[PDB]
Structures are given as C-alpha cells and as structure tokens.
C-alpha cells in the first residue's frame, strides 16, 4: 500500500511557514525511489538516518511537514539553528530524526510586481518549542504602551509578507519545503520501504 508522498510534495497549495501543514503518514510502503528520482530538489539533508538506507528502514510513524520560505532561510530548517524562522515559525528539535527536502519554487510562488500571499512571523515574545505552531494574529506590544488591538508606534502586526519577485537571486526566491519526522518507538512499525 503506497504512502501518499505525492499528496505532500506535489500538492497544489503550500502553507505559509507560520501556519505550516502536517500530514501523518502511517500503515504504508514508503518508496523514497520517487523522491530520489526527482531532480527538482536542491536540498536533501538527513539527521539520525541514512538517505541511501531509507528504502530499508521501518518506522512506527512518519510526519510530513510542509511550507514555503526564502532560499537563504533553508539553512534554518535544521536542528540547533537560529533566525526568524527557527525561532518564531518552525523549530526542529536537537534530537531530530528525519529528512529535510527543499526545492526552488520561483516558477509557482513568484509573481510580477511581487507575490505577497506567503507570510512569516516576524515578532514573538518567546522562541517556539520543537514542533510548536503559532497562528495567532494578536498585535505585538514591542513598547510599554498598551496597543489594545490597534497598530501604532511600537505596536506592530506579528506577520510580515515575503513579496517574492521573479527578479530575485536564487537565495531570495521561494522554496517549497518538506520535513520528514521519523518516530522509532519500541512498538511495531507501520511505515516500511520496498
């Protein structure tokens, strides 16, 4: 029974990094041969597992997280990293077991005059914990004066748009990201390779 990897990698709409999507992948045959055959991906980094021996490993559970960030922020989708993304949007644990796959999506996520659909959380009171999600739109009180839901001096909106332009260099173009989390519990495996 094939795992629905196409439903994640080949999805039509991708999430904004702050409101990142998650698909639980269970009770299926994970053929990573379809992802290894695809020349679209410019990043394939594994942690706690080998990419060559992925078609041999068995897991209790798999989680596929997907979202869009700028190319220069792809380095932030790794354990122990800092930045606006790792700190306020999507955090990986230090003890991470899984792979991080990214690919340039300038052909789909850029627009003439800029695409402003994609957002990222720019401000937050504290850093996110591994796999924490924050989709709140409450006004950030950067100063001492209370905002009371209104924007003003030191009272900023927490989300900021990326504005993907087709004129940008490779590092400033949008990238579609999939993060695979591998759960290896002391219980029977539901996901195995071929």
């Amino acid at each position, epitope marked *: 029974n094939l795992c629905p990897f196409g439903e994640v990698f080949n999805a*039509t709409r991708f999430a904004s990094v702050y409101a990142w999507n998650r698909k639980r992948i269970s009770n299926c045959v994970a053929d990573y041969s379809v992802l290894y055959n695809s020349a679209s991906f410019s990043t394939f980094k594994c942690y706690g597992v080998s990419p060559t021996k992925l078609n041999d490993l068995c897991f209790t559970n798999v989680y596929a997280d997907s979202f869009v960030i700028r190319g220069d922020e792809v380095r932030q989708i790794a354990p122990g990293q800092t930045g606006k993304i790792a700190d306020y949007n999507y955090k990986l644990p230090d003890d991470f077991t899984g792979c991080v796959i990214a690919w340039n999506s*300038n*052909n789909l996520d850029s*627009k*003439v*005059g800029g695409n402003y659909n994609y957002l990222y959380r720019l401000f937050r009171k504290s850093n996110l914990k591994p796999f924490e999600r924050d989709i709140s739109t409450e006004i950030y009180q950067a100063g001492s004066t209370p905002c009371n839901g209104v924007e003003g001096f030191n009272c900023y909106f927490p989300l900021q748009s990326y504005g993907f*332009q*087709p004129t940008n260099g490779v590092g400033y173009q949008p990238y579609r990201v999939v993060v695979l989390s591998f759960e290896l519990l002391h219980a029977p495996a539901t996901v195995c390779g071929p």
Partner: antibody
Amino acid sequence: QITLKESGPTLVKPTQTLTLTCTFSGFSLSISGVGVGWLRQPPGKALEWLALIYWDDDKRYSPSLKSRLTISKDTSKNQVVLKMTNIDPVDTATYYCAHHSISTIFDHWGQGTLVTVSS
Amino acid sequence: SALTQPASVSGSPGQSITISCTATSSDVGDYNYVSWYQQHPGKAPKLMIFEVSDRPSGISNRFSGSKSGNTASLTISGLQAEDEADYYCSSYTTSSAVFGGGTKLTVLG
C-alpha cells in the same frame, strides 16, 4: 489546446472607455501559477504589457497606465475583461491577450484585435 | 526602454545570426527569465526561447539562447527565408513584464 481570443469594438472615440474581453479555453484560471495578460502593439511599434490577473485574483498593471486600467476575470464564463478609461488617439493598437506563467512570461497569444481611436 | 535590441540584423541563407538584448537598468535583478518572440507580419508573437535558453516543444533547434551579464542573445543557425520576421526579447522588472524595441531580421534573397 490552450487558446485565447479577443473581442470588442473596432472603433472608439477619445475620452470614452474601451472594453475588451478575452475568451479562453484549454486551461483553468484556478490552478496555481497561472495568469492571463493583456498587451498591445501600436502599428509599426513594439509590444507593450498593460495588465495581468492571476488564478487567485491578484492584479498587476503597467505603472504608467494603472490609473486607467481595470482587469477582471469570470471563472464561469472563461473570460478576462480589460477596461481602459479616457482613451486617447495614441491608444490605437492591436490588443492581445495571452496565457501567463512566470517561466515563459507569455505564451499562446491570441490573434489580436485592431482597435482604432478616432473622433 | 528597460531592454535594448538592435533595430535590425541581416544575414544570407545558411549563415548564423545573433540578436542582442541588453538590460538598461538594475530593475531586471538577476535577469533569469528572458523570453524571445518571433513575429511575422499581421501575426501574433510566437515564443521561441524562454528562461534565457529553454526551447518550447515544436521549436527548431536552430534557435538558441544565452546570456553574458546583462546581455541576452538569440542565435539563429542555418538561416532560412521563413526566419525573416520581427524578434522581441522580454523579461521582468520589479513591477512589470517588459519588452525590447524589436529587431527586424532580414534574410537576403
């Protein structure tokens, strides 16, 4: 096959509003990364982009003509309409509508419609 | 205006010709999306090359694209009479889809 066709008046007087329609087929203006553009070519002159509308209704215009341009889509009728207010003699041109993707800029152009502006 | 092309280029059958497209400003950024259009009289523009050097399906391999800095080039090898047409380059600025002024190509008969 992806096809686009322009329709509208062949003669308009200055100060009036020119309304052109683009009837397309062979593709959906709902799929991500797809758009439809309106361009023009004055006789013996270069191609010039006027407006563009994306699958998500995000609209882009030529900054120098933005105040007079209005683009819209009708997903049900397969039409993309361009309205140009305060028409002037320099607006006499063949008007084209074309399929847009970031990668190609514009492909599958329509045959065009020569619009004459005269009082 | 944002892109500059020679007004005209000419060659004889069997030869190779090159049409340039120089970006006049920084507004094109990385200048990665460069398309070339062939336009015959009274006809609609036809996409010959996109993304500097990619060829749409059905376009002869005699047409090729390349770029050196801010100058993109369309090369046509084995020049044939039917190649005589207007050629336009196109790209993006931070606000618009722009075009060069066009180049009338003459194949001497």
